[PDB]
Structure formats: C-alpha cells, structure tokens
Amino acid sequence: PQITLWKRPLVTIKIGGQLKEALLDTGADDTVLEEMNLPGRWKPKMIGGIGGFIKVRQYDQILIEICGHKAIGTVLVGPTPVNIIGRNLLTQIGCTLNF
Amino acid sequence: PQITLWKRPLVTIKIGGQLKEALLDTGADDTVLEEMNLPGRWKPKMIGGIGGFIKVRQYDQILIEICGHKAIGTVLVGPTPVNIIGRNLLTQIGCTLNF
Ligand SMILES: COC(=O)N[C@H](C(=O)N[C@@H](Cc1ccccc1)[C@@H](O)C[C@H](Cc1ccccc1)NC(=O)O[C@H]1CO[C@H]2OCC[C@H]21)C(C)C
C-alpha cells in the first residue's frame, strides 16, 4: 500500500506467532522490538539513537510478516519505547520513499 | 524521486544558506539538526529518542530546502548524532512510504 506521514506510520506485524504494532522507520538501520521472550540463541548488542544507547538481545533469521509481506532477518529485542521496523527488513518488502 | 533503502536515505539540504547532509526519517516526529548557527529567535526544548532525552533549541518557521523541495517549519538544533528530517517537514515535500 501507500502510507502517508501525517501520523506515525504504524502497521500490524506478525512475529513469533504474535501480532504487534510497529513503526516503519527509514531512519533505523536495524529492527528493534519491545521486550518479548523469543526462543533460541541470541547475542548481546548495543544500539544507539538520540539520547544514547540501550542494551538489546540480537536474534538472527527471525521471520516477520509486515502487512502480509514476509521478511526474514535480524531482530533486536530490548527496552525500546516503540517497536521499530528498520531498513534491514524494509528492503525485503520492497519499501521505498517517494516524493 | 523514488528512494530505496539498501543504503541510508541521505540527502543534501540547504538551511540558513548552508548545505548539509541529512537523513530522511519516517520514524521521527520532528526534524533535528546538529549544533549550528541559525538566524532568528529560539526557545529551549527537550526531545526524546531511543536512548533518552536531549536539550535542543527550537526554531520556528525556518526555511529549509530538501533536494530542491522547499519546506518552512520547525527545526530543532542540538547534540543529535545525525541530521534527521522528520515527518513535520517530510509531509510538506509530499513524501510517502510505498510497498
Ligand atoms: C544506526 O543508528 C540507528 O539506526 N538508530 C535507530 C534510531 O534511533 N533512529 C532514529 C533516527 C536516528 C537517531 C540517531 C542516530 C541514527 C538514526 C529514528 O529513526 C527512530 C526513533 C524511534 C523512536 C520514536 C519515539 C521515541 C523513541 C525512539 N525516532 C526518533 O528518535 O525521533 C526523535 C526525533 O523526533 C522525535 O519523534 C520520535 C521520537 C523523537 C535505532 C531505532 C536503531
């Protein structure tokens, strides 16, 4: 579809068998989701933005469905205030900016 | 134009007569630029991000040119790690997300 930017571009995603709301974010290199218990091994990581860094758990080869479009990649889990879909998965669903 | 997301969506902007590089960021409500000397009056403000909050200078009704498209609106100036163009100006240049 086409998503305007008058409001935060929030969409429904499906991950680990759960439905969640997440922000489509062209300014994020990576995907960061709110604390959740995902199975499997993980690696510690630090990600930064405005204000500093937060500690997250890095999960690899995670399947996410974004408005019916499937993506598979690295997902970070930690104390983020909002679920963020970053460029690593947005490229897989063929998302582009247009103006 | 149409911009893919394999690389960071960086563009050249012109503000206060100076050229700078900035990130087109659908995950930002507001536009935040690195410390710089802008003409006009300003007010203190605080903005938050993934790491916490930072103190910024809020400039209102500022003219900014984003890849040749003119916008006039609120610009925040402070210790952000990268210049970000947020939704407040992205809407003025007619930017949308498509997939
Ligand atoms: C390589 O580094 C990265 O990719 N970092 C990503 C990242 O932080 N990206 C930033 C832009 C960015 C900033 C610094 C360095 C690189 C990019 C943005 O895209 C996403 C955030 C999301 C958000 C939304 C609401 C509350 C907290 C956080 N938006 C934001 O901070 O917006 C600010 C400014 O506007 C305000 O509205 C919303 C909050 C306010 C991480 C997500 C991985």
UniProtKB/TrEMBL annotation, chains A, B:
Residues 20-89 form the Peptidase A2 domain. It comes from the Viruses. GO terms for biological process: proteolysis. The keyword Protease applies. It is a lipid-anchor. InterPro entries: Aspartic_peptidase_AS (IPR001969), Peptidase_A2_cat (IPR001995), Peptidase_aspartic_dom_sf (IPR021109), Retropepsin-like_cat_dom (IPR034170), Retropepsins (IPR018061). The keyword Hydrolase applies. GO terms for cellular component: host multivesicular body; virion membrane. Its main location: host cell. Pfam families: RVP (PF00077). It is found in: Host endosome, Host multivesicular body; Virion membrane. Keywords: Aspartyl protease, Host endosome, Hydrolase, Protease. One of its GO terms (molecular function) is aspartic-type endopeptidase activity. This is Protease. The gene is pol.
